[PDB]
């Protein structure tokens, strides 16, 4: 029964990494506020002009606005090497807002992906009233589902202070006899319901839309073929790296990888950097669906003047 001892030297450049990431996060927050705010304003203001503004766009803009608005709390906790000066209620409330809004944004991406194909094929001869009612029902259900899936993670979250480090943190405190399960459980719900199912639906229902547009002759003259694959690829690039980093973390936790201080440094750096890249997702959504479209450009130009 051999024994072994290993020390993990304190990381030298953590400060430099976190300071650079804060520099990126400030720009993310500023641009996200600007983009999402203007989209919501134009979406509300366009209904007067007579446009049939789509509800999903408005809900997506709101969800992105909330997620991006919760950044400053993260920045403050990040500058201080991930320590929680604030109280327990602040940590719970901020996490719940972040989780619910982020999940809602992803679900709305999937919803519009399906709705585009349904609109070209099936709803092409449905009265405006019926389609609007269906949209409202779907929007309410999506919000409810996001809230329901967000609750469990926040419920078990608590703030503590390290006995030795003498520093304050906020972290999840799952039931003593199920911690492992809970952890793994949440991650699956964070992946399947987060990436696998949404991405699969989006890819399939945009490929079908492209095929249908190809079968058409008048539409493809006015539409764009690449931009559809641009949506899919942008989603993949924004989200896949972060989920891959997360999956690597779980693999490390279960000891699927030998332990090395260098491994810890790379995982720490990768998780934080990919988190910043993922949050760029809320920054970029407004452009993909609103700024590209010519009608939005014209309406936004009119409003700006």
């Amino acid at each position: 029964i051999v024994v072994d001892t290993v020390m993990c030297p304190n990381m030298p450049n953590k400060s430099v990494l976190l300071y650079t990431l804060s520099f990126i996060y400030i720009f993310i927050f500023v641009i996200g506020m600007i983009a999402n705010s203007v989209v919501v304003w134009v979406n509300i203001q366009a209904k007067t002009t007579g446009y049939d503004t789509h509800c999903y766009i408005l809900n997506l803009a709101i969800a992105d606005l909330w997620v991006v608005l919760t950044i400053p709390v993260w920045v403050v906790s990040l500058v201080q090497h991930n320590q929680w000066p604030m109280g327990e209620l602040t940590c719970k409330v901020t996490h719940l807002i972040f989780s619910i809004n982020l999940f809602g944004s992803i679900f709305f991406l999937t919803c519009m992906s399906v709705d585009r194909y349904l609109s070209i094929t099936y709803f092409t001869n449905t009265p405006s009233s019926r389609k609007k009612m269906v949209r409202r029902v779907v929007c309410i259900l999506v919000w409810l589902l996001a809230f329901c899936v967000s609750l469990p993670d926040t419920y078990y979250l608590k703030t503590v202070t390290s006995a030795s480090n003498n520093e304050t943190y906020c972290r999840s405190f799952y039931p003593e006899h199920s911690i492992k399960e809970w952890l793994i459980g949440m991650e699956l719900v964070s992946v399947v319901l987060g990436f696998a199912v949404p991405f699969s639906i989006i890819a399939v229902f945009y490929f079908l839309l492209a095929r249908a547009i190809s079968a058409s002759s008048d539409q493809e003259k006015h539409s764009s073929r690449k931009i559809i694959f641009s949506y899919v690829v942008v989603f993949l690039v924004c989200w896949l790296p972060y989920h891959v980093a997360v999956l690597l973390d779980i693999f490390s936790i279960l000891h699927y990888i030998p332990f090395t201080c260098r491994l810890e440094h790379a995982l720490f750096t990768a998780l934080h950097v990919t988190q910043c890249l993922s949050l760029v997702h809320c920054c970029v959504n407004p452009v993909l669906y609103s700024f590209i479209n010519r009608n939005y450009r014209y309406e936004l130009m009119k409003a700006f003047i």
Partner: antibody
Amino acid sequence: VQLVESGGGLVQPGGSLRLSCAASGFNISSSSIHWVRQAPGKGLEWVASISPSYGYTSYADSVKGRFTISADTSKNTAYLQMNSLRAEDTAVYYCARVSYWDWTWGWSKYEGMDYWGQGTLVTVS
Amino acid sequence: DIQMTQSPSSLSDRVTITCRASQSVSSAVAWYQQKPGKAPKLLIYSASSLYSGVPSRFSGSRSGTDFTLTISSLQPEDFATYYCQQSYYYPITFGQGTKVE
């Protein structure tokens, strides 16, 4: 993109009759086909509509229960089947298209009827 | 049936045709123009959006449920029976037509 109507004529009340709307251009699976009858010295009046992609029909409350509408996707046309005509059923029938455009999906307007045929005249002696 | 009341049914240039609905339709109203013995052609789809190629004289509007079409430049060709329409609720209901002379 042109629509031409073929049918019409004189048939005594109580019989059957068929109408066709032939379309040349856009494929018929990305727009909805509607029929509008204008009676002699009267105004326009909706009759029926169809989405050929899946077959979501719809009829006015006056004809609900004696008419049929079916779209031929292979030849890109529409066919309306009539049963049990009426004394006032005489009218000039137009076939119209309500369009659609995916390049305005998120921020779209309420499209109407833009392409109207010339129409066939049905008479019920 | 969401009946549409289109008035006036006659007219004598500042030309206004005001059309209202029983319920409220979210800017689904349209307008048309069929000349004697001819198929109607669209003039304003949705609330107040001209159709590509339609002259600039035609101009729409909306007041919640008191829709109205305006032509502040009356030209000789613009003589026909314009039919106010709504598409928000099935069935599609047309106005009564406002013949101009």
